[PDB]
Ligand binder design. Structure first.
Ligand SMILES: OC[C@H]1O[C@H](O[C@H]2[C@H](O)[C@@H](O)[C@@H](O)O[C@@H]2CO)[C@H](O)[C@@H](O)[C@@H]1O
Length: 380
């Protein structure tokens, strides 16, 4: 027998993030190449190489991988996941000086506050819009209710009315919330985790309309991000539902498209969840100063955001100076019109489970594995 030797816990350990460089995680639907260009700028000014990666399921991996040799110095995701990360102590506190704070809309900072700390930098405000083919559909529908009839008409030309991703609850949430579905009730400065609205009559009606759309063969339960994107970008479906990031690929397809208000349901506006794309610094990073310099002086500038935006559009950006130029874009006006009708996502730790529950519920209802009532009861 011997005592455990020095550094044993490091031999049995998961490693350490490398000092002297920057590793960034951002989702694969975002402008990671443009972000790498920013990285390149940072490198030639500082010598510090910036590596940008878009792993799959990064928002799920981060809490297991954060404090390991594979953890990134900087993580990008919509602000909803960050409260969970903060509670898990995964996030370094963010300390921008006053002059820097003033450069971003104050309400974007609020989106990245958890328990009276700033736990990330806000980048851009995101929301879904109805994206339509102006040649197939010069006047897109104002109501969800008229979509089945519109589909039948388009099927006579070997076309369809609507395809969008049915594997992520994010995309059908605007329908679910329209007549009163909600995640967590907000009452007096606080989210009440005991008051969940995925099971009420608004949610049910919304999800039922989706299920009927599928049953009546206006939509297919198996449609995902890729299938719906190809279909719209090839001119096979008249409308899709997506965010600003999706606009680059449509530009390339030379489909003649518009971005407009989502259709109403039961006379009520569709209420898409609003996400603020945010950048957090890893608590286990030994490069926190570099990360701060990168985010504040390279990314969050007119030149930095543009580089990313040109790769894949960001939405309404948190940086005032550059947003004034993006605000003129009709697609951004539409984006903001849809966001305004919806609601910002909660950032509470319970979001992650909420999302998984709602994801499961939609997939099961659409597949017929469960009725709407059974699925949403399970979720609640
Ligand atoms: O579907 C659940 C999912 O919704 C949101 O994810 C969005 C994200 O906000 C967008 O930036 C874009 O990448 O599409 C995603 C949906 O596929 C939540 O932010 C995410 O936490 C949640 O799991």
């Amino acid at each position: 027998m011997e005592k455990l030797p020095p550094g044993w816990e490091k031999r049995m350990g998961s490693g350490k993030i490398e000092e002297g460089k920057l590793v960034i995680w951002i989702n694969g639907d975002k402008g990671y190449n443009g972000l790498a260009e920013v990285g390149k700028k940072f490198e030639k000014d500082t010598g510090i190489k910036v590596t940008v990666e878009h792993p799959d399921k990064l928002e799920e991996k981060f809490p297991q991988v954060a404090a390991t040799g594979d953890g990134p110095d900087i993580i990008f995701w919509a602000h909803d996941r960050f409260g969970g990360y903060a509670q898990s102590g995964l996030l370094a506190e963010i300390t921008p000086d006053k002059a820097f704070q003033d450069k971003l809309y104050p309400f974007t900072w609020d989106a990245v506050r958890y328990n009276g700390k700033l736990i990330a930098y806000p980048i851009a405000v995101e929301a879904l819009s109805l994206i339509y083919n102006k040649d197939l559909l010069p006047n897109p529908p104002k109501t969800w209710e008229e979509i089945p009839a519109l589909d039948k008409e388009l099927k006579a030309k070997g076309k369809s009315a609507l395809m969008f991703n049915l594997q992520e609850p994010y995309f059908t949430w605007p329908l679910i919330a329209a007549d009163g579905g909600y995640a967590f009730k907000y009452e007096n400065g606080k989210y009440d985790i005991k008051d969940v609205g995925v099971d009420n009559a608004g949610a049910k009606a919304g999800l039922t309309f989706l299920v009927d759309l599928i049953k009546n063969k206006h939509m297919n339960a198996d449609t995902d991000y890729s299938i719906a994107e190809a279909a719209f970008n090839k001119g096979e479906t008249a409308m899709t539902i997506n965010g600003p990031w999706a606009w680059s690929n449509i530009d390339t397809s030379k489909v003649n498209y518009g971005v407009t208000v989502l259709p109403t349901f039961k006379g009520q506006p569709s209420k898409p969840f609003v996400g603020v794309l945010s950048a957090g610094i890893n608590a286990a990073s030994p490069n926190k100063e570099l990360a701060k310099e990168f985010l504040e002086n390279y990314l969050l500038t007119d030149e930095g955001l543009e580089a990313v935006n040109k790769d894949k559009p960001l939405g309404a950006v948190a940086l005032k100076s550059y947003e004034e130029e993006l605000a003129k874009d009709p697609r951004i006006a539409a984006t903001m019109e849809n966001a305004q009708k919806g609601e910002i996502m909660p950032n509470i730790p319970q979001m992650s489970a909420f999302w998984y529950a709602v994801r499961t519920a939609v997939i099961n209802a659409a597949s017929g594995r469960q009725t709407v009532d059974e699925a949403l009861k399970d979720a609640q």
